[PDB]
Design a protein around this ligand. Sequence first.
Ligand SMILES: [Ca+2]
Lengths: 63, 281
Amino acid sequence: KTEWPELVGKSVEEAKKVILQDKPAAQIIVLPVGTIVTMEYRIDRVRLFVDKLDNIAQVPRVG
Amino acid sequence: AQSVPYGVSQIKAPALHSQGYTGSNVKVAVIDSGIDSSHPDLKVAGGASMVPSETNPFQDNNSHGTHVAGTVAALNNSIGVLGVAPSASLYAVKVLGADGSGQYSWIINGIEWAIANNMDVINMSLGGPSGSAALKAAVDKAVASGVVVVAAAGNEGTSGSSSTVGYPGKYPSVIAVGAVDSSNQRASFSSVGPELDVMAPGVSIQSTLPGNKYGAYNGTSMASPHVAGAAALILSKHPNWTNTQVRSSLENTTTKLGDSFYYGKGLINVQAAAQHHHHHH
Ligand SMILES: [Ca+2]
């Protein structure tokens, strides 16, 4: 499992719980949606982009 | 002892160094998370920060900008690694904070600073999934001012017959760079599409890390600086070539690889680019 479309709209706490169950060594970082990010590829990382309600705004994916 | 990363030799950069072309007096802005200016294998000429909470551009709290900077210009000596353009004038334009992210306005601010400070080359090992008219305007203005603008194509792999190139790489004014390994095979994460221009080494790339360290990273972020450094080598041999001529020399002298949708023009060859005779620019 590398993508989580079912988590769009969930809170950060809810999303982290599911991702860690599916990918125990996931390196999760939370950022505002609409930002620019570094383009290195990290297979263990999962960025969570959040909206103004602090909910997952985009499909989480490894990288 | 110094070790030359495979990618530097693969794009034929040491051929130019042996002729005396090392990027001297060419100004390259690394628009990224800052550059650790204290690294013994780097010489930072200047910089500026656009990150409100991190005014010092010479403190890299992420590590990515220092690694990108080492691919462009790690010093030629008896320690660490070797950059593509080891004599380049390297500028730390910090637009990303410790978490590796930045607002679009901070990236645009860094591009505006780069134009105002007469940078010859801009490297942007960064991107986002959406564009903006202001971001497009900034990269277009830099190219209209004569700057060579290079960016990572993105790490979004494939999606049917659609483009996965992110922004600012997707704009036609920018040279969007994908990633290959030491065997010239496209990395599965490398973005694809009509906007992909050229490829460069982006798998297991050794470079400088903050605190007098070295390490390997993967990504189109690692491929981009090989091309930005190659542009600086070309300008050190041909100071009168326009950005249009530097870009065409790199795109029209590549080693052809796979289909253009996945590989663009192919792998850059800076030795061939620096010997190029233009017929259209
Ligand atoms: Ca060195």
